[PDB]
Design an enzyme around this catalytic site. Structure first.
Site, mmCIF file in Angstrom:
data_model
loop_
_atom_site.group_PDB
_atom_site.id
_atom_site.type_symbol
_atom_site.label_atom_id
_atom_site.label_comp_id
_atom_site.label_asym_id
_atom_site.label_seq_id
_atom_site.Cartn_x
_atom_site.Cartn_y
_atom_site.Cartn_z
ATOM 1 N N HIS A 94 35.291 33.951 44.543
ATOM 2 C CA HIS A 94 36.033 32.975 43.749
ATOM 3 C C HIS A 94 37.485 33.388 43.527
ATOM 4 C CE1 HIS A 94 32.987 29.961 42.286
ATOM 5 N NE2 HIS A 94 32.188 30.889 42.780
ATOM 6 N N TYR A 114 37.113 37.196 37.780
ATOM 7 C CA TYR A 114 38.482 37.339 38.244
ATOM 8 C C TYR A 114 39.153 38.572 37.658
ATOM 9 C CZ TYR A 114 36.827 32.566 37.576
ATOM 10 O OH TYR A 114 36.040 31.443 37.477
ATOM 11 N N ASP A 115 38.381 39.468 37.051
ATOM 12 C CA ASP A 115 38.924 40.604 36.326
ATOM 13 C C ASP A 115 39.209 41.772 37.259
ATOM 14 O OD1 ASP A 115 36.931 42.996 36.185
ATOM 15 O OD2 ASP A 115 35.652 41.250 35.839
#
Lengths: 997, 145, 670, 145
Positions: A163, A126-127
């Protein structure tokens, strides 16, 4: 520093499977198809916050304290969902913002991952660290994190942030963290999965930053399993756990379909040497990006056969770019010396040459390798690769061989076109030959036919040369049609149209919005890899580097001239010569049509101009005593038959004049004079055949007649055989196109041919036939003798007399006897040839007409009939100048011009100056012309009107008289010396040193 | 700054008063070198002397635009009407213009068969000042006040 | 490609079937009603476009256009080399990503390449998110350019740097070099534009040629073919009208310079661009010289008003200094007489030369100087030094440039001989004022101060020592002596015999006390000392001791020659002395017949002493260049030699085309 | 057939005789003229003639290498030993060889941070032959025969 050395020690200690995997990753990387699944492990190197941190934070908020226990994969997801539900989503988002909102910096692995030209980078993280990692290297990517981003696909390269990510916002709704999001992924993100599956299908996934048992790894594993059997290459896994991989787990995930690599299996490392492990594996792969798999020197022949065997297709390749086959490892210099530029392994190329020298070493090979070396050595010999630069002994470069298209052969060309085409290469040769013959439309259709048949047989080289040739010939057709419709009508008076308008529409339709610059890009990866040399031909801006080479070398050669510096070894001019013959052999052997293009002609022209310019200077170069000590009696520049045909084909006649004026060509001896004579005989005969027959292909005529004009003009130096001289003259006078060569150019070309080789009585008969034909062209009064060089058939007859003291052309004499008063124009023409006819004919014509005006007077004196000036002749001169004076005072109110009268008035001034005519009236007409005043009365005449043409144009006797008269001798010497000092000119220097001083 | 007397060349049919094409002059080359009997070999006697000099005029133009009628309708001869302004050093700008004409010329350009790749739009056309026995050179210069 | 934009300042209508909208746009520019009628925002677009086309030099359609003009507006600071101004801007704070681009380009020209790379990166971070495609791309370009430049500089340092500098320098740190070799490893600048977002490439297709690693290839081939057209024009003696090839290369050169300097591309500083500029100028000036020396033909001059002559502007001086080496400018001056060209902008050229001298004075006066910038600027400094001859300088400017040349210039990159000949070139235009005489006296007295040490000896490639400088000083000031050097004699002792030898060469620049000191402390009895005494004027006639000393030297050389017959023969340096002596005999200066015995050397010795027996086929006409007017007259007057020399000279000059051989023959017409 | 003067050059320390680097000769330049001086100095003594011609010898060597020891250890003087076969008109190459040597030289190279983008390995180093008061220049030639 030594990390690379220790890692190269690791490489080649690696298990074969690992090295083969690494090479496969590298090859797919170059193909722009390799894709990477980068996990938090790589981001861990950045110290990016880990999901377990937020998990424990959630646990503390839920139950008032952390777990103090390991979370399972289910727990890592389950506890987040318990927090999301029991408390809610607000503190969920708050904790995501608190933890993940950090400006962590990227690390070496983050940019290494990009060094493989990732087609895509599908990251479950998620970075936003991975986004920047992409810029770091330079690869562009399109970030996708939702269903909406699936539309926003600007590029062909995806950073598929699966995601979800906090780019939408630090919210669990915007990512997949809580357990339910993981379970409901198939329903929550149909479109990200839609892309995901397809990208996984064909692209070469290579896992990294992940654990073998990671949930996302398992999902991708099942998804690749869903594919058809044997319909997916096993993606790779760059595993980097500090502990060595258990053999059982290795067997398991190799069976599952993953090509896994453990850093720990390759190196030794500490427990927290994660970055070291990632770097070890990734940098082993990067060093594989360079070819360092050259194991042993005895293996050399297999390597060179892998590189060169597909290269046999071409009839020759330039040694300039042969280095590109080995990726700048061994620079093949122009002379053939193979300069070692790089070689990770030993015996990369040098062992091949040591085998070439040591025959006993060549015997150690298997007969397979023996014949492999044999074929490769034959290829290098074709290339002119003389020897390895390191051990290269004394060299003797020579003229590169060229095909028959380079030779002046056209009958062979048509015979072969008539002959049945055996196969595709035969048809490609036929297409080029038809293009050369001007049958551009047949050549084009054959090129298309072979396009089809060549992709059918999978001859990538033949097809690609056919594509580029088809585009080049189409451009020639289009430009030729433009030239015709625009200027041919002014040229001929009625524009032709060999190319049918429907054909032009068809060829334009077949090719539109198509740039050959992209032709190589559009080829298969197989062909593109095995034929990177032929990329040079793709760009429409042909000779994309030979022009720069010429520019630099011309500069250098001029500098060598101006510096007056000696040289040792091959000099600049040597490499210009070598590049020129390399380019010629390449283009003509490969049957490319690109030679006829202007740009290649200009390149050849400039090269040969520089070569001959340095040839002239070295001849007159002065040698110092130490200059003589180093070397003496240096080799001279030569002019072989091949260099003649270059000059003929690529230079224009004005260029040949320019170079002859600048450089005394006659001094440098010619080579292969017999072959030169044969090729000139061929030109002459071809012109005879083409012009005697009505059939004159217009496009072919424009293509080649320039060649013939140049060859005839430049044939002034070479000797010709008697039969050869007959053929060449008979071509020059009768069958040569009168449209291009006027009478004057015809005469001066014949005079040059005379200057080298004498005209025997046979040639005298030929020129007499031409003159009698001009008489037979003169029966019509409308016919006119007209030339640009002021040269007429009278000059031809003067040449015949210059050769034959006594010559009575009975044809001309009979004509004059047949001539009557009404044929007064023919009487004038035969008068111009009065010396050439019989005594009875002379009396007949004298009866017919005599001098009556100034024009006829100059005619007569040129023929020499009147040996003394009568009072009537000088009185006629006085009358003509009276007319000129009234016309000049009338023209005084207007602008005054003199372009033909000036000749007569200058001659009259000359005659006053030569005291031939005492008439004082010619003095009375002084003041009209500067030269007139200069001659009649030089003293009064002001010597500021002296012209440079006067300074260089002159007569020997007139120069003697000028020196004899001191008043004009002072002024003329002053201005002439001043001019030579301003600009050193050969004629000025001769005029100085010979007549006055 | 640069040459401010742009040349308008009108190239007309000689047999009939029709204009063929107009262009802009680019360069003019003049050569006065003896090539008759090469350099030496002409007629020479003690009391007789003949000026054997021969000269040739070359002219180049650019931006050729042809008259529509000449294309429509399509020994033949043509003329030239080179048109420039006479400028003196004293008077770099003069109301008077200089009129150069070549009534006898032959169109024969080496640009024919020039097949350069990519963009091209310089149809330079070469001409040679064709001569006649009666008149050594046909070129003429007249200045209109 | 809808409309070809002709370089002259107009636009040609390339084949198109649109609305004729550049024609309409220039009708708008022409007509005030047309432009007024537009919508206000459309009117702003129209006038902004007009201002842009004026900036790029576009005026109107090529057909619509008429007379045009050419000039220079490359106003980049790096183009002028205002390094003080350049670093002053750098240290000044940036407020834009374009400001950071400007700082990065300036840091590249000042040798602070590390800072340039870091700032480039910084702009990339600042622009990746903000999506400034042009600035982002261009910063990546120049980042690659500086990585190239630093790689080549380091490679030079590791290799030839040892022998040239005499030391191993490592100005760039290993960690920084590896960091940058890695941060953008395996990266094709060609593919950058290809891989860039589509929007940016569509909007700025201009920058494709920037993408190409071999950029300016099109420039190179264009210049090459234009050069071919230029050489053909020179050969055929044409008379071009309107634009010609030379004007085309002028405008192309000038356009490329201005583009790459205003865009601040660090690629401007590469050697390929320097080569293109050098070639372009060289063509321009050889064309100017050829135009000066051309026939009339009574047609070309008449059409255009008066005549357009070539001249040198401040920008031309800048380009030539920046992009020529000393061999380039020297070969140029040899082939083409720059003196004929009338220079212009003398004051601005003076200001630039003063800036060059100020920069090198700042570098060398202080012990600290950036090595990489020193390499970048020395060649420019050298070229500006050598090229300053042709421009007029003021007393302050002349003082600065000369003091740079002598004291602040490196000895390694320019020896004493170059130093002196460059000086004497400089004064040809500006006669030595008291200031320059004082500066040369100061530098000379320093040379004396180094010569106080017995270890020091003067070294010069050209053989032009302190004596030449003193000769120049007394040439411009017939009455001059150095007080510093006099008081050196007052303290001079026989122990410093090498200092006495150095000072013996400089006798005329000294007081009578110093002359007596030189006479007493040592004698003039040596061949080299005898030559020195002759040169300085101490001895005018060869005493019996002097002639006998010369005879003994020739006896030593004779025995050495006899030994050399059996052990190989070497003749470079002695033969100079023997030739001088043979001329002295030929000029009735030496009378001893012992020299006739010494005959046997075939360079000006057996020739001058015994012309009759000399084999004149061995004579080299190049010898005539070394002789002066007096010796030329004597040599020409002697019957035993005059015929052979005139025949060899005239045949060799007729085969050649040297002007000096013409002059020698002119004096030989007798 | 090519020019057979593939000379070998040995660059040695003149101070100690230690070999520095070896390579192959490329070019040699010779220029000699007269210093642009005066003749009125004092009384321009007629009897005092003087030869003021000065000559410079420029050189270049290609394929420059280096000695391990010279790299190891790191007013200074340098020596050059030009080794060439004695080409003479009688035979393409004579049994004897010609030795050319310049005991004095300095390494003022033209390289000066040449930043050509090209991947070419030609570290050409130029050489100016130094002079001294005693000797015009150290250029020396001997003949093996």
């Amino acid at each position: 520093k030594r990390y690379g050395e220790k890692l190269k020690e690791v490489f080649l200690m690696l298990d074969n499977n690992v090295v083969e995997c690494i090479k496969e990753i590298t090859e797919s990387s170059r193909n722009g198809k390799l894709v990477f699944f980068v996990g938090a492990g790589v981001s861990t190197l950045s110290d990016y916050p880990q999901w377990w941190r937020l998990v424990d934070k959630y646990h503390e908020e839920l139950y008032g304290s952390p777990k103090k226990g390991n979370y399972s994969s289910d727990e890592y997801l389950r506890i987040p969902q318990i927090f999301y539900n029991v408390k809610g989503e607000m503190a969920f988002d708050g904790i995501l913002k608190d933890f993940f909102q950090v400006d962590k910096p990227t690390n070496p692995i983050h940019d290494k991952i990009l060094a493989m030209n990732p087609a895509h980078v599908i990251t479950t993280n998620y970075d936003n660290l991975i986004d920047t990692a992409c810029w770091k290297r330079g690869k562009y990517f399109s970030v996708i994190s939702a269903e909406e981003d699936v539309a926003n696909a600007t590029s062909s390269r995806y950073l598929l942030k699966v995601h979800g990510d906090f780019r939408k916002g630090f919210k669990g709704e915007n990512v997949v963290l809580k357990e339910d999001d993981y379970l409901n992924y198939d329903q929550n993100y149909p479109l990200i999965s839609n892309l995901m599956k397809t990208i996984i299908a064909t692209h070469t996934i290579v896992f990294i930053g992940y654990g073998l048992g990671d949930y996302n790894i398992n999902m991708l594993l099942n998804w690749v399993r869903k594919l058809q059997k044997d319909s997916f290459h096993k993606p790779f896994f760059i595993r980097t756990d500090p502990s060595p991989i258990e053999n059982e787990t290795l067997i398991y995930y190799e069976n599952k379909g993953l090509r896994i690599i453990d850093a720990a299996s390759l190196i030794d490392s500490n427990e927290y040497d994660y970055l070291e492990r990632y770097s070890a594996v990734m940098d082993l792969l990067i060093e594989s990006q360079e070819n360092k798999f050259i194991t042993k020197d005895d293996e050399v022949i297999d390597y060179i056969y892998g590189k060169i065997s597909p290269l046999f297709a071409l009839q020759y390749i330039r040694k300039i770019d042969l280095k590109h086959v080995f990726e700048y490892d061994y620079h093949f210099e122009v002379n053939g010396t193979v300069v070692r530029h790089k070689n990770k392994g030993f015996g990369y190329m040098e062992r091949f040459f040591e085998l070439k020298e040591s025959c006993d070493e060549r015997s150690k090979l298997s007969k397979k390798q023996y014949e492999r070396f044999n074929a490769l050595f034959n290829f290098f010999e074709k290339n002119g690769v003389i020897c390895m630069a390191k051990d290269a002994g004394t060299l003797n470069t020579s003229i590169e061989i060229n095909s028959l298209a380079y030779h002046g052969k056209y009958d062979v060309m048509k015979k072969f076109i008539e002959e049945q085409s055996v196969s595709i290469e035969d048809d490609y040769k036929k297409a080029f030959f038809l293009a050369c013959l001007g049958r551009w439309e047949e050549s084009y259709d054959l090129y298309s036919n072979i396009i089809l048949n060549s992709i059918d047989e999978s001859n990538g080289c033949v097809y690609y040369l056919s594509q580029i040739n088809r585009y080049r010939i189409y451009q020639s057709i289009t430009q030729a049609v433009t030239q015709f419709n625009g200027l041919g009508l002014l040229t001929f008076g009625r524009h032709y149209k060999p190319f049918t308008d429907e054909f032009l529409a068809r060829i334009e339709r077949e090719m539109t919005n198509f740039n050959i610059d992209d032709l190589f890009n559009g080829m298969p990866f197989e062909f593109q890899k095995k034929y990177k040399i032929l990329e040079f031909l793709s760009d429409n801006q042909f000779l994309y580097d030979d022009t720069v080479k010429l520019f630099e070398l011309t500069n250098k050669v001029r500098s060598e001239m101006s510096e007056g510096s000696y040289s040792f070894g091959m000099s600049s001019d040597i490499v210009v010569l070598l590049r020129l013959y390399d380019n010629l052999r390449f283009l003509y052997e490969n049957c490319l049509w690109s030679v006829s293009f202007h740009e290649f002609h200009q390149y050849i022209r400039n090269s040969m101009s520089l070569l001959i310019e340095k040839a002239e200077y070295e001849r007159t170069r002065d040698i110092d005593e130490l200059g003589f000590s180093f070397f003496g009696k240096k080799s001279g520049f030569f002019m072989e038959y091949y260099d003649f045909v270059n000059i003929s084909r690529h230079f224009k006649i004005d260029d040949i004049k320019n170079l002859e004026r600048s450089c005394s060509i006659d001094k440098i001896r010619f080579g292969e004079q017999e072959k030169i004579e044969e090729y000139l005989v061929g030109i002459a005969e071809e012109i005879t055949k083409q012009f005697s027959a009505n059939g004159m292909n217009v496009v072919f005529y424009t293509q080649f007649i320039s060649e013939a004009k140049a060859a005839l003009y430049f044939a002034k130096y070479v000797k010709l055989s008697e039969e050869g001289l007959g053929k060449i003259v008979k071509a020059l006078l009768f069958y040569f196109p009168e449209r291009d060569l006027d009478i004057g150019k015809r005469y001066v070309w014949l005079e040059r041919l005379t200057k080298c080789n004498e005209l025997p009585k046979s040639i005298i008969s030929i020129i007499d036939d031409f003159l009698v034909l001009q008489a037979e062209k003169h029966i019509d009064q409308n016919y006119s003798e007209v030339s640009s060089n002021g040269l007429y058939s009278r000059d031809y007859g003067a040449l015949i007399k210059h050769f034959e003291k006594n010559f009575i052309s009975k044809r001309l004499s009979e004509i004059t006897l047949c001539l009557t008063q009404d044929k007064q124009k023919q009487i004038d023409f035969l008068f111009k040839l009065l010396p050439l006819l019989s005594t009875n004919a002379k009396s007949h014509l004298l009866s017919f007409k005599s001098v009556e005006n100034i024009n006829d007077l100059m005619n007569g004196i040129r023929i020499g009939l009147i040996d003394e000036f009568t009072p009537e002749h000088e009185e006629l001169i006085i009358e003509y100048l009276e007319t000129r004076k009234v016309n000049y005072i009338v023209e005084k109110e207007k602008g005054i011009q003199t372009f033909s009268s000036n000749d007569y008035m200058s001659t009259f001034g000359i005659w006053y100056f030569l005291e031939e005519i005492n008439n004082s009236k010619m003095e009375e007409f002084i003041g009209m012309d500067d030269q007139y005043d200069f001659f009649v009365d030089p003293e009064n005449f002001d010597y500021k009107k002296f012209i440079p043409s006067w300074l260089k144009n002159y007569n020997d006797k007139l120069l003697g008289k000028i020196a004899g008269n001191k008043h004009m001798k002072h002024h003329v010497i002053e201005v002439l010396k001043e001019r030579v000092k301003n600009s050193n000119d050969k004629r000025y220097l001769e005029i100085l040193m010979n007549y006055f001083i | 700054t640069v040459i401010q007397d742009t040349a308008d060349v009108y190239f007309k049919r000689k047999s009939d008063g029709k204009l063929v094409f107009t262009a802009e002059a680019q360069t003019a080359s003049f050569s006065q070198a003896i090539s008759e009997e090469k350099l030496r070999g002409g007629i020479g006697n003690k009391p007789l002397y003949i000026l054997k000099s021969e000269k040739e005029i070359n002219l180049t133009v650019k931006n050729a635009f042809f008259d529509l009628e000449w294309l429509a309708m399509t020994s033949e001869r043509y003329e030239v009407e080179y048109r420039t302004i006479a400028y003196n050093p004293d008077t770099e700008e003069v109301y008077s213009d200089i009129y150069i004409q070549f009534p006898n010329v032959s169109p024969s350009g080496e640009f024919e068969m020039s097949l350069e790749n990519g963009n091209a739009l310089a149809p330079e056309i070469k001409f040679e000042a064709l001569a006649d026995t009666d008149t050594d050179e046909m070129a003429v210069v007249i200045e209109a006040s």
